[PDB]
Write a protein that binds this ligand. Sequence first.
Ligand SMILES: *C(=O)[C@@H](NC(=O)/C(=N\OC(C)(C)C(=O)O)c1csc(N)n1)[C@@H]1NC(C(=O)O)=C(C[n+]2ccccc2)CS1
Ligand SMILES: [Cl-]
Ligand SMILES: [Cl-]
Ligand SMILES: [Cl-]
Ligand SMILES: [Cl-]
Lengths: 242, 229
Amino acid sequence: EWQENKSWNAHFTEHKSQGVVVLWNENKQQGFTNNLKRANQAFLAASTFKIPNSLIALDLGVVKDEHQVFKWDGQTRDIATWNRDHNLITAMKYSVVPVYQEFARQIGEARMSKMLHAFDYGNEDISGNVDSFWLDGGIRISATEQISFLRKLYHNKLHVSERSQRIVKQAMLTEANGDYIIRAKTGYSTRIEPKIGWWVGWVELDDNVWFFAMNMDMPTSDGLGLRQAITKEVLKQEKIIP
Amino acid sequence: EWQENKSWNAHFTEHKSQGVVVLWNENKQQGFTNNLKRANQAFLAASTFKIPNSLIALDLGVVKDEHQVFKWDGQTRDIATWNRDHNLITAMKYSVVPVYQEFARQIGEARMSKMLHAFDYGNEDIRISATEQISFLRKLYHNKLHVSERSQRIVKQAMLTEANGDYIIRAKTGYSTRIEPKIGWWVGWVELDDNVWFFAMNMDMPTSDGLGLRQAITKEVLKQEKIIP
Ligand SMILES: *C(=O)[C@@H](NC(=O)/C(=N\OC(C)(C)C(=O)O)c1csc(N)n1)[C@@H]1NC(C(=O)O)=C(C[n+]2ccccc2)CS1
Ligand SMILES: [Cl-]
Ligand SMILES: [Cl-]
Ligand SMILES: [Cl-]
Ligand SMILES: [Cl-]
């Protein structure tokens, strides 16, 4: 069912890095990874938690639609793009943490936890600050656990409205051309060791969907582009994209 | 409300071509075009019709959703990408006429004519102008058409054409050669962080080798107006 392809490691070593890529061929229900053990190692979800946090917020009406504006609170923050108004689309594109902490507080522990148990999401543990548990709280999720969650999202199978799932898959739009469509969220876990980078989503082809989840050691923010670059080297190595 | 910017004509004649491009800045609610007369001329919609058709099919049930598989009837047509199975996403992409022909049969004239008239589409008794395309497209963007929100969302999904960290383009191509003038279309919009530019262009397409120019000339104009890099 799974299959180890350690060749992929050359892409991590080329860039002097370490991590795991996990691929899943929907048509052939076959997974692939350079490291089956690390594929199942659970880390903080960091901003990949913005997928489930969007779904819940939309489904509870915290977010009415992807046009609703969330005004900047006027607190200038190290991340220049955080210091403006945002709707769901730009908030996900630019991982606007404070916008989603506010979603989190309006959701509340109770519903947050109930929903993560409905979603089957990683270790389902929200314990910590309701508005930071995904950065420095209890929640743990592995790459293969990201793929099970995303596959459900992709078939409108989560226990929230079809519309909610449709609007979140829209906000995940990352890349589209005439060979593929990538829908995906980045993560950068940096408050608790180990420092890692996430990239989770999937690539849509004419006649298949390839779901991916990768994470990798991220000591300094200089390697943040490697998250996507190494994934695509794998996808390009496996002929999923040209 | 409509400014003529004849400067754009150079993007047409550098490619030894004649046409119109129509832009609509949505924030400011102002449009701009290289040719005001040609922007209100109605040409054959050709495949740009696949948009209202997709909506009606969806909102009626001919199409359950964008995953449903429309199997090839085994008849080999000259466009190779038609000679296979397709879903809404790939039938819009490849402009698979015989798939859409079938949608329309199952929709049937009566229902089709009633809805086309509810969208106030092309003619009220198909030809439509570049500026009528924009106006239809703006309602689609805001989910203001008289079909379900779901209908409208799935069609915008199926209109996805290009996306990066500078813009998203949702659009549909069109090409007709039965009748003069032979015209290509490209209609849709480009989404920015805090604005959305609708576009509609058409151009004399006297052969076919210049089909890429529908997209190329449109981007040269978006590039000029600083809307995209
Ligand atoms: C879209 O507009 C479709 N156009 C047609 O199918 C053509 N004619 O339709 C008639 C009946 C004439 C009409 O008025 O609608 C047609 C295609 S080629 C030719 N000599 N007549 C599809 N047009 C698109 C497109 O937007 O360009 C096609 C994409 N394509 C083009 C060239 C080669 C392969 C694929 C296919 S048809
Ligand atoms: Cl979050
Ligand atoms: Cl909803
Ligand atoms: Cl989309
Ligand atoms: Cl379909």
